[PDB]
Every structure is written in structure tokens, then in C-alpha cells.
């Protein structure tokens, strides 16, 4: 098309394991993951460009009476961003 | 720490018509449709700009005869920045 992504990665729908429409969730994951990102030949090979996995998670969150912040997380994780990752600083 | 070519902020957000309130976490570009950094290393025929994606509510539905019926009625989440190499015309 007229627009090009450095990292190839898959978006899909996936239906949550415990539960008139049902509710999908949709995730993205690396086609790829960890290989070098397109045009990765045009930055010194000092930070090898690759393709990062990232998710997101179910997040709970509780403020206490004094202000603390108590989060709770599903340990399943869902992959969410596929993008390119540079070793600099 | 590894950079990125697209800075965005990643943050816990609430949704706003036990006692744990459900919260998204969500990633915006800290400059969507601003060049991506490193632009320069990539052929000049392109425009490589810092996009923002999303995700949002999908609820599916099929009927009897195989029909899909989808609703996505919902707000967008903010879910991705990430850069965009538009292609030159031509």
C-alpha cells in the first residue's frame, strides 16, 4: 500500500478463556520476533535494529485512605506492539 | 534501555461513564505525524512519520447462514506508536 512498517506483525482477535454478541480481544503479534527490521542496513550495525514484542496487561488498581496505590495484574499477557528496536541510548 | 524511532508515553487510564477500579494502559506518541528519528536513513522517497495506533471493543456475532455481524461501538485505545514510512507518489 503507500504504507510500509519496519517490522512485519499479525493482528488478530482471540477469545478470553473465561467468561447476544461475544467480546474478542484483539492482539498484535511479531511476525518475526527479534529479527532485524527493514532497512536495518541503512543504521550501523551498532544497534542492531529488531523487532520488539510488547503487551499490555489486565490492570487493577486500588488508592488506599493514605494515598498508596495497590495494582493488581492477569498473569496472561497480550501482545499488543510489534516494533523496532534500537540499541542506543 | 533500547530506543525507539517514535517516543510515546505509555500510562494507566480509567474509563468514564472488590474495590479495584479497572483501569487500560494505554501507549499515545508523544509526537504523532512528527518525522520518526533516524529519517535520514531511510530513502529519500519516503516520508517516515510516527503513527498512532489503536485497538478498540470488538464484539462478533454469526448468524444461521455464516453471516458475521461486528460491532465496534466503542471508544478507541490508544495502543502503539510506530513509525510509518508513507510512499512517495509516482
Known amino acids: 500500500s503507500d504504507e510500509r512498517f519496519l517490522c512485519r506483525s499479525i493482528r488478530k482477535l482471540v477469545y478470553p478463556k473465561k467468561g447476544e454478541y461475544k467480546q474478542a480481544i484483539q492482539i498484535e503479534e511479531c511476525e518475526g520476533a527479534d529479527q532485524p527490521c527493514d532497512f536495518a542496513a541503512n543504521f550501523p550495525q551498532s544497534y542492531n535494529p529488531i523487532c520488539k514484542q510488547h503487551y499490555t496487561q489486565q490492570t487493577l488498581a486500588s488508592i488506599k485512605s493514605d494515598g498508596?496505590?495497590?495494582?493488581?495484574?492477569?498473569?496472561?499477557?497480550?501482545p499488543s506492539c510489534c516494533?523496532?528496536?534500537l540499541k542506543t541510548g
Not at 498508596?68 to 499477557?77: A, H, I, P, R
Open 68 to 78: 498508596e496505590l495497590d495494582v493488581v495484574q492477569n498473569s496472561f499477557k497480550i
Open 83 to 85: 516494533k523496532c528496536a
